[PDB]
Ligand binder design. Structure first.
Ligand SMILES: CCCCCCSC[C@H](NC(=O)CC[C@H]([NH3+])C(=O)O)C(=O)NCC(=O)O
Ligand SMILES: CCCCCCSC[C@H](NC(=O)CC[C@H]([NH3+])C(=O)O)C(=O)NCC(=O)O
Ligand SMILES: [Zn+2]
Lengths: 225, 225
């Protein structure tokens, strides 16, 4: 039912794909590949702020990545049981959202800047974020980040870890609880399926992605790290 | 009584001040002035990600601006009645959060870039955001953005409007419904008191704010537009 409008790549839409898959929800995708269809999309006025991601779900044309994620999380009970749990989930998700946010521009960076940005991301992961989540798991010694059950915070943390490992395969060295976490969460049926071949999970963005985005939107021609 | 940890200025903490005040909740503030004072915080490790804003409320050390705001909004019934309305509130707040986000670095910009950034913001406001919100009110024939009843989205839009008017006094020129909206929200007792002199509302950030930030966090020395 849900239709995700975006480019054929990760970008800001990937986390939405992750959350939907984790909830075992099947979705379709509409890839923007030409300046024509985009302008036609702006014509219809279905993009409230003239921006994508855009997701058609339950009779709504939702824009704003966080709005879309929040709704999917709440609808499929992955947002906790009370306001207090939701506050923890939002706090944890805020950390990983910042971490993955540093890699959003990577594809558009020059071969030179990519090296600097890459070192930056790894530094942030191992010195700021990983320690923080490692401490949370140890503080309560539970299998999940909150409510002793799977939540959006778990899914978002698993995605961030895999993205960091794509840059440094041994990034989890020195964080045994997170390493166990990674294994456990990956084993969950819906997630295991998304990680398996033939899923709608997108691969690391390449030059074809960078070009398509630059043509359709006519922006990000000079992304600075 | 919730305690807010940040610098003596707007920054990312201002919206939190707005939300608490609108809900009619008094709060205390703790301004960071010395680098050694910040290191003390890190020492106790109260800042999960070594960052501020940080708010102590209901026995929690919440970090991540959006996490804090989502909590305050839901706790004081300013987050809609159901998931659908919440989705609408998040989508709207996403827009004004982006708009105000463009003015976050302004204080650290140069006289050269400030004139550039100022034109960029007013441009985005009048051609992308204000038209969107103006349309919501007209097409739905409502006096409030969601559920035709005060919600966080209304409070976040009023703040954004006032920030744009500080840069261009006649920015709302051409948006009659937003001008009526501005008067309607400002007349709400709690908000009216926050706009009156003597409140906890912070002024536009000045050089003294910038110097302090750079002195405490030791960064943001080269902030490009
Ligand atoms: C650094 C390059 C990587 C950026 C990837 C592009 S995402 C596409 C971009 N959308 C946004 O920036 C949306 C921001 C919005 N706050 C959200 O979170 O959804 C867009 O449509 N932009 C068109 C526009 O702004 O007009
Ligand atoms: C462009 C200049 C504008 C000034 C913004 C400063 S807010 C202070 C800054 N905090 C953040 O960036 C927090 C981001 C976090 N995602 C949130 O929204 O709360 C910090 O603690 N930084 C210290 C650090 O990152 O270690
Ligand atoms: Zn190694």
């Amino acid at each position: 039912k849900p239709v995700l409008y975006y480019f054929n790549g990760r970008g800001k839409m990937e986390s939405i794909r992750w959350l939907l898959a984790a909830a075992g929800v099947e979705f379709e995708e509409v890839f923007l590949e030409t300046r024509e269809q985009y302008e036609k999309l702006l014509q219809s006025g279905i993009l409230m702020f003239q921006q994508v991601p855009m997701v058609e779900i339950d009779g709504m044309k939702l824009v704003q990545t966080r709005a879309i994620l929040n709704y999917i999380a709440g609808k499929y009970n992955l947002y906790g049981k009370d306001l207090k749990e939701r506050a923890l989930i939002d706090m944890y998700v805020g950390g990983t959202d910042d971490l993955m946010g540093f890699l959003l521009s990577f594809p558009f960076l020059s071969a030179e800047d990519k090296v600097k940005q890459c070192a930056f991301v790894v530094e942030k992961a191992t010195s700021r974020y990983f320690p923080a989540y490692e401490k949370v798991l140890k503080d309560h010694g539970q299998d999940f980040l909150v409510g002793n059950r799977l939540s959006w915070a778990d899914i978002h943390l698993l995605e961030a870890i895999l993205m960091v490992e794509e840059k440094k395969s041994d990034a989890l060295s020195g964080f045994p609880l997170l390493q166990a976490f990674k294994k456990r969460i990956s084993s969950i049926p819906t997630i295991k399926k998304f990680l398996a071949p033939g899923s709608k999970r997108k691969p690391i963005s390449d030059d074809k992605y960078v070009e398509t985005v630059r043509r359709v939107l006519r922006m990000y021609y000079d992304v600075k790290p």
